[PDB]
Amino acid sequence: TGHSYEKYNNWETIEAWTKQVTSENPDLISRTAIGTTFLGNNIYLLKVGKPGPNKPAIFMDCGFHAREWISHAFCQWFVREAVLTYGYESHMTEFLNKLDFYVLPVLNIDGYIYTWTKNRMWRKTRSTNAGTTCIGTDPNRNFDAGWCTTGASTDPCDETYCGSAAESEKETKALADFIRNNLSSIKAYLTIHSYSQMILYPYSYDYKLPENNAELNNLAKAAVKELATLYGTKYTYGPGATTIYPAAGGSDDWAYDQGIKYSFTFELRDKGRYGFILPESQIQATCEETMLAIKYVTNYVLGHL
Numbered sequence: 001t002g003h004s005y006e007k008y009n010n011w012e013t014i015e016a017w018t019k020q021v022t023s024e025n026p027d028l029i030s031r032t033a034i035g036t037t038f039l040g041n042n043i044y045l046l047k048v049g050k051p052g053p054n055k056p057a058i059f060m061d062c063g064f065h066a067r068e069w070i071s072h073a074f075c076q077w078f079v080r081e082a083v084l085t086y087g088y089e090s091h092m093t094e095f096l097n098k099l100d101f102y103v104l105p106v107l108n109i110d111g112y113i114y115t116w117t118k119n120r121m122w123r124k125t126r127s128t129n130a131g132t133t134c135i136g137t138d139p140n141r142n143f144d145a146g147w148c149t150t151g152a153s154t155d156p157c158d159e160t161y162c163g164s165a166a167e168s169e170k171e172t173k174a175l176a177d178f179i180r181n182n183l184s185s186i187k188a189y190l191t192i193h194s195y196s197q198m199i200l201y202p203y204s205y206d207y208k209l210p211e212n213n214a215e216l217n218n219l220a221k222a223a224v225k226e227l228a229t230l231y232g233t234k235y236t237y238g239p240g241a242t243t244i245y246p247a248a249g250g251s252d253d254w255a256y257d258q259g260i261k262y263s264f265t266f267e268l269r270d271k272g273r274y275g276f277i278l279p280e281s282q283i284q285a286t287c288e289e290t291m292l293a294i295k296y297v298t299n300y301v302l303g304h305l
């Protein structure tokens with residue numbers, strides 16, 4: 001039950017943590033909920049930064065995919081590092097003064113609970129589907145970006161089911177609703193996954209390249225170089241379609257086509273030795289090196305608005 005930053009925490013524990021870290025840091029963190037899940041859990045959002053007028057923001061979510069436990073761990077790690085180093089480390093101090101980080105600790109809460117209780121390898125949501133006993137939609141194929149046109153299934157029984165319609169899932173509708181309602185301020189979108197050690201940018205739903213792909217490639221390149229300084233961990237990077245494989249309906253592509261010009265999917269450790277079942281013993285090293293890339297991106301975005 002007790003929360004630890006070097007262990008994977010269950011939802012009850014993460015929920016208690018969002019309340020605790022917010023009460024302990026009132027001038028640095030506010031908590032709201034942006035929606036409920038299919039099974040009635042609260043989708044918490046943390047706003048991290050020193051409040052002020054007309055602040056730009058960066059949006060980061062974790063836990064799209066239930067089994068990718070290091071993703072959830074990173075969002076929690078980020079929040080503590082922000083509050084611990086504010087006022088002492090120049091860069092984080094400037095970040096929190098000038099912008100807000102929206103941190104969504106766990107999007108697909110229902111699936112995450114399922115990985116703790118029944119099936120460690122679950123990935124989808126846990127919503128019911130008409131006409132079948134098969135459960136769940138892949139939330140990262142459920143966005144309105146070339147929806148269900150490639151790299152996706154129309155069968156609810158498949159792991160890549162794109163859903164009955166774009167934003168059919170309460171969770172993805174809640175996230176899209178929030179982003180749409182905050183487009184004027186959100187300057188970047190970061191979505192945290194594992195595994196494969198990559199930084200992806202648009203597009204995945206099509207082989208076409210984003211208008212600013214040269215810029216996005218240079219930024220990804222610089223970010224993976226920064227990440228490698230700590231433990232030598234090697235990341236690859238590029239447009240999703242060629243860097244992994246085509247897949248429609250992803251939140252990074254959707255956010256980009258909303259006008260959020262800096263949109264990245266992070267795939268964290270490792271490369272397949274442990275895969276989704278990354279040992280807790282690697283949480284600290286993974287989070288620490290990932291922090292460097294996230295901060296590099298953040299500084300770049302701040303210098304380009």
Ligand SMILES: N=C(N)Nc1cccc([C@H](CP(=O)(O)CCCc2ccccc2)C(=O)O)c1
Nearest residue numbers: 193194195196204240244245247250251253265
């Ligand atoms: N919009 C996007 N970024 N779409 C996208 C493109 C390629 C891959 C993915 C995800 C990757 P993921 O988050 O589950 C991590 C997959 C890790 C992996 C890697 C190799 C073999 C088996 C498993 C997917 O397969 O749904 C999304």
Ligand SMILES: [Zn+2]
Nearest residue numbers: 065068193194
């Ligand atoms: Zn994933």
